[PDB]
């Protein structure tokens, strides 16, 4: 057996969100029910509902209001709809199989996960800026450099240094909503005597907006 | 409704100990229970169901025990594998109810930060924003304070913080401080300095630049 969620990744505030599970491997009309949980961010989870093979649906009653849990038999897919959303609704849906009855035991067991996020941001590109060290702050034999990923929604971003050959002392910070857009900053580390000697860059990807951007660290001077 | 309560909230581990999470319900459940674990940046998956039957696949140094409102899921000989999340379900009762998590990161020796200071980009400031970086870098224990000071006296707003999970190959932490000024306020100051407090040192490293 094999659950997929899928569905839009932003929903805005005060509508409605919606998410499909497809199962394959098994049948929904058959046995178990069909169950939708999340994961709010600070990881917390929390059980939203089920539909069970014979289309009888329970509800946490904390979701009573704004859920409704429906299925097509056709496709072997069930669905989520959550209405009248805000923020704390943000969160990481996941669908999943459990046993109805008591007897026969049946382990519970969940799909993938997907984020939804809610929000009334535009899609906006990155601005892109870097890091280097106050001329001269103290040298040692390594020195470490950064870029500042401002202003950018949705996410994800993803930054690389010198494409991929700098792979070791590298860290990318995750990112922080600042004023309805996201922020972050990766941090990349090298001998001092390769700096600026050897030429360090770092790519930022935001595929969202079809955006690639270089910024070549340079010493400040 | 059920209320479940785990612990510990977090525990740092060695690879060959023993470790024991502990679930609380608020009633008997009747090992309607079921443990679930959650590999970092990963999904959910049971390992557990019925407080003690242990899904296949699911390795043998796993196993769960317990009755009535007390169980409890041990590792016999941690692996790297194991560090994650781990979450206990009730499911005798609707709402079904989760654990807040208990969260298995790996021990080490102690590490001081390196931090460096950022300032503002020419490009930024064409724009008319100021953003000052700090890092605080691949420290141990997780436990790390920071302070901003502008000529002498502390800043609080205006200040977003960023912390990475547990390094999986070096099991260090790292944090990113940044204070976002506008131009015109970060102008009219000279001295900009970033603190990082840790259990390494008795007085904090600090890092400085001045405008000129």
Redesign the interface.
């Known amino acids: 057996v094999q659950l997929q969620e899928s569905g839009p990744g932003l929903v805005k505030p005060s509508q409605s969100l919606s998410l499909t599970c497809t199962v394959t491997g098994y049948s929904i009309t058959s046995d178990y029910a069909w169950n939708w949980?999340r994961?709010f961010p600070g990881?917390?989870?929390?059980?939203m509902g089920y539909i069970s093979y014979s289309g009888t649906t329970?509800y946490?009653?904390?979701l009573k209001s704004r859920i409704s849990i429906t299925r097509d038999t056709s496709k072997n897919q069930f669905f989520l709809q959550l209405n009248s959303v805000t923020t704390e609704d943000t969160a990481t849906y996941?669908c999943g199989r459990?046993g109805v009855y008591?007897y026969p035991?049946?382990?519970?067991?969940?799909?993938?996960?997907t984020l939804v996020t809610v929000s009334a941001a535009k899609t906006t590109p990155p601005?892109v800026?870097?890091?280097?060290?106050?001329s001269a702050?103290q040298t040692n034999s390594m020195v470490?450099l950064?870029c500042?990923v401002?202003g950018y929604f949705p996410e994800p971003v993803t930054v690389t240094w010198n494409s991929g050959s700098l792979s070791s002392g590298v860290?990318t910070?995750?990112?922080?909503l600042?004023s309805d857009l996201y922020?972050?900053?990766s941090?990349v580390?090298v001998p001092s005597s390769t700096w600026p000697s050897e030429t360090v860059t770092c790519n930022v990807a935001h595929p969202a907006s079809s955006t690639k951007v270089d910024k070549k660290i340079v010493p400040?001077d | 409704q059920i209320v479940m309560t785990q612990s510990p909230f977090s525990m740092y581990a060695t690879l060959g100990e023993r470790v024991t999470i502990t679930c609380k319900a608020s009633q008997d459940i009747y090992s309607?229970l079921?443990w679930?674990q959650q590999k970092p940046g990963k999904?959910?998956?049971?390992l557990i169901?019925?407080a003690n039957?242990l899904?296949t696949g699911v390795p043998s140094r796993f196993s769960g025990s317990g009755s009535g409102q007390d169980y409890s899921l041990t590792i016999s000989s941690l692996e790297y594998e194991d560090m994650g999340?781990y979450?206990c379900?009730q499911?005798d009762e609707?709402?079904?109810?989760?654990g807040?998590?208990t969260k298995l990161e790996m021990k080490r020796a102690d590490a001081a930060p390196?931090v460096?200071?950022?300032?503002?980009?020419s490009?930024?400031l064409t724009?008319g924003?100021a953003?000052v970086?700090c890092?605080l870098?691949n420290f141990y224990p997780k436990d790390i304070n920071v302070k901003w000071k502008i000529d002498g006296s502390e800043r609080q707003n205006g200040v977003?913080?960023?912390?990475?999970d547990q390094?999986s190959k070096d099991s260090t932490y790292?944090?990113?401080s940044?204070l976002?000024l506008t131009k015109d306020e970060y102008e009219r100051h000279n001295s900009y300095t970033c603190e990082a407090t840790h259990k390494t040192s008795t007085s904090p490293i600090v890092?400085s630049?001045?405008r000129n």
Not at chain 2, 43 to 46: E, G, N, Q, W
Not at chain 2, 116 to 121: A, E, V
Request: charged share 15%.
């Open positions: 949980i994961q990881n917390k989870l929390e059980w329970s946490n009653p904390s996941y459990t008591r035991e049946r382990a519970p067991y969940w799909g993938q996960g601005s800026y870097p890091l280097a060290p106050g702050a470490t950064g500042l401002k860290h910070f995750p990112a922080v600042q922020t972050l900053s941090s580390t400040r | 309607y079921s679930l999904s959910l998956k049971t169901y019925r039957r899904i999340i979450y379900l499911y609707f709402p079904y109810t989760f807040g998590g390196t460096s200071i950022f300032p503002p980009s490009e930024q724009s924003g953003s970086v890092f870098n977003l913080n960023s912390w990475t390094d790292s944090m990113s940044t976002t890092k630049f001045n």
